[PDB]
Design a protein around this ligand. Structure first.
Ligand SMILES: [Mg+2]
Ligand SMILES: [Zn+2]
Lengths: 117, 74, 60, 95
């Protein structure tokens, strides 16, 4: 569901858990750091997503949310001073959650479900 | 009182060193082994730990994190 | 230097002053209406009773 | 030490031949012009000058007889003029 994703992104934004990008994401996945990964399939030439898959194959669970620009928007990359979006364009190709921070029950049931697949 | 003139320089210019940005930089560091295993084209640094890639320029490999203390000939 | 041009040249300040265009305005009523406006502005709409009348008070 | 000011669009150099009274001077401008020079503003009683002094003077295009002296050079910026040579060098003015 949509709720657990925003909850986990908030809990990793406040405690610096988001590997906002792909190089930091790749380094976190290579290390014992990246506990979750959200990436978009609407990526040109698709090789970055394939490389990410590989990173998660070796810290396993991944999420397949679309709308890269929207993904960055609700990923907290924006300063979002006003109520509405105050920046033209901002987005993230890959988001990696390292620090689980605060825990909510619905989100943990969701991550167990996505682990079960 | 002071009588100062416009300064004249016998130097053309020194320009700010612009960082060499690379698009699609990260993927060149790795290599997908046909929908499955993946390898790394660069070498891993021992002092920092897993993940950090060595820098090969010529007959040596160089680090970025502990950059100063690691420069080992190939 | 000491002088930016030929010193004794005629029409100097006139030549080099910045031409600032007239500001467009609403029409100022003329005749009896103007006298009525002045009377209202001075003897029934007393603005600065302190000191003098101080018509055209500089803004500071 | 101050920068020496060159002529521009009408002003020209000259040398005082004999200084008259009432703020008047006879000045030889280096176009063969034995002109009359008037002591002028910023020059009334702030800087003093004498006979045989290098001088800079602005012309008056509506009357070429008289001309208004503006700046005086202190016998060392005169030397600089002399080396760069904008004024005729067929004249010796030394101490
Ligand atoms: Mg006089
Ligand atoms: Zn290192």
């Amino acid at each position: 569901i949509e709720d657990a994703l925003k909850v986990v992104l908030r809990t990793s934004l406040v405690h610096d858990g988001l590997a906002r990008g792909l190089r930091e994401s790749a380094k976190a996945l290579t290390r014992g750091e990246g506990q979750l990964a959200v990436l978009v399939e609407s990526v040109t030439e698709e090789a970055i997503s394939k490389l990410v898959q590989g990173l998660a194959t070796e810290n396993v669970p991944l999420i397949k949310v679309a709308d890269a620009k929207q993904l960055g928007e609700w990923a907290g990359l924006g300063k979002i001073d006003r109520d509405g979006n105050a920046r033209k364009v901002v987005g993230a190709s890959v988001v990696v959650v390292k620090n689980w921070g605060a825990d909510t029950q619905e989100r943990e049931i969701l991550l167990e479900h996505f682990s079960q697949q | 009182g002071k009588k100062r003139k416009k300064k004249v320089y016998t130097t053309p210019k020194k320009i700010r060193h612009k960082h060499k940005k690379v698009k699609l930089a990260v993927l060149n560091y790795y290599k997908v082994d046909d929908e499955g295993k993946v390898a790394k084209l660069r070498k891993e640094c021992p002092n920092c730990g897993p993940g950090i890639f060595l820098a090969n320029h010529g007959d040596r490999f160089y680090c970025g994190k502990c950059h100063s203390t690691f420069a080992t000939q190939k | 230097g000491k002088v930016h041009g030929s010193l004794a040249r005629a029409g100097k300040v006139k030549s080099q002053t910045p031409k600032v265009e007239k500001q467009e305005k609403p029409k100022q009523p003329k005749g009896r209406a103007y006298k009525r406006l002045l009377y209202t502005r001075r003897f029934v709409n007393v603005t600065l009773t302190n000191g003098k009348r101080k018509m055209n008070p500089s803004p500071s | 030490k101050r920068e020496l000011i060159y002529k521009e669009e009408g002003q020209e150099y000259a040398q005082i031949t004999k200084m008259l009274g009432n703020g008047r001077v006879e000045a030889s401008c280096f176009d063969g012009n034995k002109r009359m020079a008037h002591i002028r503003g910023k020059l009334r009683k702030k800087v003093w000058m004498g006979q045989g002094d290098i001088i800079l003077v602005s012309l008056r295009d509506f009357q070429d007889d008289q001309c208004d002296v503006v700046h005086k050079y202190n016998l060392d910026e005169a030397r600089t003029l002399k080396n760069q040579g904008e004024l005729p060098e067929n004249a010796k003015i030394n101490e």
